[PDB]
């Protein structure tokens, strides 16, 4: 264990010396690609080497044939994918891939989207991959509606859903360029399926709080929305019975009451704050500040009384 790490070091060190020497001499050639491939595999965060690779590839593009240049690009794509398999969270590796694809004459974006789906199967929360997928989706011009379809499959097939809900929060406003009530209603139905499927999944509760803010306002509740929110309220109370340590459902009850009728539900709101603090005492200070805010809002409403 301890001895071969000294010999890895000595190799890394000698390879690094060698790269820098070559670079100073202006030797922008395949030997540099050879040497950096040895270092970047274990050490993809060594940024200056990704820069050396780009400098080599740029230079070679000038003095090699179209066919030779195309071969170097396909080799680069392979090298990048092997590097990502070892460390799929390196900023440098993902940026190099983007640099490389952005400068091709005819990139294969459909194959890059599949690469994304493959990495997201392995780690649904890898934000580097989601960001790359966005880049690719833009470059190709994949419509929001297809990306929406992607997200749904991801949310239902297993959990670790924060990143998929986040993407939905950005896609929905693009389909409808503050959401339309009909869209909002379908979204609420999808999310409350989630949080009833897995009540400990934080992600659906965070996204549901957003949805509760993203619509009309309480003085403008439609009958259908009013009815949906009351139904959610009752559903959260049943969950509270089944899961009395669940803090997300208690907070959400308080928020639903606010969305429905702050003054009519004032007593129950106050009771729920007490229960919630006892269930989530690390959030006591936040909860007290939220209750203070809500009480001021209620004073203002009582005083708007003609």
């Amino acid at each position: 264990k301890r001895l071969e790490r000294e010999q890895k070091l000595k190799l890394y060190q000698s390879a690094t010396q060698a790269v820098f020497q070559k670079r100073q001499a202006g030797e922008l050639d395949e030997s540099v690609l050879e040497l950096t491939s040895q270092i970047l595999g274990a050490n993809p965060d060594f940024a200056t080497l990704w820069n050396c690779r780009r400098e080599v590839l740029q230079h070679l593009e000038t003095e090699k044939s179209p066919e030779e240049s195309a071969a170097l690009v396909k080799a680069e794509l392979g090298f990048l994918e092997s590097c990502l398999r070892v460390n799929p969270k390196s900023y440098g590796t993902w940026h190099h891939r983007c640099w490389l694809l952005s400068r091709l004459p005819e990139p294969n974006w459909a194959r890059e989207l599949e690469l994304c789906a493959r990495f997201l199967e392995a780690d649904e929360r890898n934000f580097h991959c989601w960001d790359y997928r966005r880049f690719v989706a833009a470059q190709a011009a994949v419509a929001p509606a297809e990306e929406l379809a992607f997200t749904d499959s991801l949310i239902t097939r297993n959990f670790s859903n924060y990143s998929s809900w986040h993407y939905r929060s950005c896609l929905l406003p693009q389909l409808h360029p503050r959401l339309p009530e009909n869209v909002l209603l379908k979204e609420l139905e999808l999310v409350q399926n989630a949080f009833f499927t897995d009540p400990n999944d934080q992600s659906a509760w965070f996204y549901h709080r957003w949805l509760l803010g993203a619509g009309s306002g309480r003085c403008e509740l439609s009958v259908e929305k009013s009815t949906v929110l009351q139904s959610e309220l009752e559903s959260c109370k049943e969950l509270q019975e089944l899961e009395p340590e669940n803090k997300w459902c208690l907070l959400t009850i308080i928020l639903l009451m606010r969305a429905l009728d702050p003054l009519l539900y004032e007593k129950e709101t106050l009771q729920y704050f007490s229960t919630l603090k006892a269930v989530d005492p690390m959030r006591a200070a936040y909860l007290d500040d939220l209750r203070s805010k809500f009480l001021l809002e209620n004073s203002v409403l009582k005083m708007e009384y003609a």
Binding site: R5, L9, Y12, Q13, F20, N43, D45, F46, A47, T48, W50, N51, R54, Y91, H95, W99, R125, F127, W130, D131, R134, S160, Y162, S163, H166, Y167, S169, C170, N200, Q202, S203, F206, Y207, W210, P281, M282, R283, A285, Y286, D289, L290, K293
Partner: protein
């Protein structure tokens, strides 16, 4: 659900003497050699934590100043180490160090300003370097570097503001680029940016503050986003953000302090990401800086914006107004 359980013989006292010893000897090896690509930042982490502990004199000022000068490139930018390439990250670290040492004219300030100005894009964003990677981390590096040099006016500030605000998300947080998911480190960079540029009124402090306080797990430690393990360096990213937006009291101070103390190595000194792991200077800085934000009387008060002793920022007269 994902959390650590802290074992009951975990350290529960602050071992400052051990930490200073650990950092003072750190340069004197595998990780050290393999992390040369971040050396300028590593030197920053060491010097800052030493100064928070009142031990900066134990480090080698003169040698560090020569090393910084040799890392300034002809474009004005600073690299992580000699022969590496200039980047905004290391340009920031360098200027932070020289600020700690009141030695800013060791490098060519005019050229640093020109290097930063040059990396701003038409949409207001900053690239990290000439190769074009765009990240709000680099918007923070650019304005923090310029603020410390008295040169914030050198960039297009309104455009830079609009870009950072385009990275605000449904949950109140910030991502690295438009449409990127929220996470603590990015939130720190963007709130830090908004403090420096006087735009904290654009943050929804109650919504973001809530997302941040929900980073605290039953162990007391903080994660950087939903459903991840806690890590002592979130003591910095999360707390500093909470402080900038006036919501530091939304976390349980005592539970966090016990988590942070349990991350210490009682034998070697240093803090690790989680109790029992191997320590490093990165986690050592953020553990100590987190304790300082929590009001630990043996540690100098730390700026939540610049992660340096407040007394340093007082000296240069750059202390952005926070929310409260």
């Amino acid at each position: 659900q994902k959390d650590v359980t802290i074992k009951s013989d975990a350290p529960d006292t602050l071992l400052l003497e051990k930490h200073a010893d650990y950092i003072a000897s750190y340069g004197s090896d595998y990780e050290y050699c393999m992390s040369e690509y971040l050396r300028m930042s590593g030197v920053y982490w060491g010097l800052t934590v030493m100064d928070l502990m009142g031990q900066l004199h134990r480090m080698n000022k003169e040698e560090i100043l020569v090393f910084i000068k040799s890392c300034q490139h002809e474009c004005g930018g600073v690299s992580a180490s000699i022969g590496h390439d200039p980047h905004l990250l290391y340009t920031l670290s360098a200027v932070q160090i020289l600020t700690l040492y009141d030695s800013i004219h060791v490098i060519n300030v005019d050229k640093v300003v020109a290097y930063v100005q040059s990396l701003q894009k038409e949409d207001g964003s900053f690239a990290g370097d000439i190769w074009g990677e765009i990240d709000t981390r680099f918007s923070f590096c650019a304005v923090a570097t310029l603020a410390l040099l008295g040169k914030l006016d050198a960039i297009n500030v309104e455009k830079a503001i609009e870009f950072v605000l385009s990275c605000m998300n449904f949950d109140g947080g910030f991502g690295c680029r438009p449409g990127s998911e929220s996470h603590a480190g990015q939130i720190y960079c963007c709130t830090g940016f908004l403090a420096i540029t006087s735009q904290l009124h654009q943050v929804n402090s109650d919504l973001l503050g809530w997302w941040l306080c929900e980073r605290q797990l039953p162990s007391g430690g903080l994660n950087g986003r939903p459903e991840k393990l806690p890590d002592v360096c979130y003591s910095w990213w999360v707390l500093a953000s909470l402080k900038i937006i006036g919501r530091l009291h939304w976390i349980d101070r005592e539970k966090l302090r016990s988590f942070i103390l349990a991350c210490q190595d009682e034998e070697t000194g240093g803090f690790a990401d989680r109790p029992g792991d191997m320590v490093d200077p990165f986690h050592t800085l953020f553990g100590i800086a987190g304790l300082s934000l929590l009001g630990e009387e043996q540690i100098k008060p730390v700026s939540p914006v610049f992660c340096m002793p407040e007394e340093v920022l007082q000296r240069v007269n750059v202390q952005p107004e926070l929310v409260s």
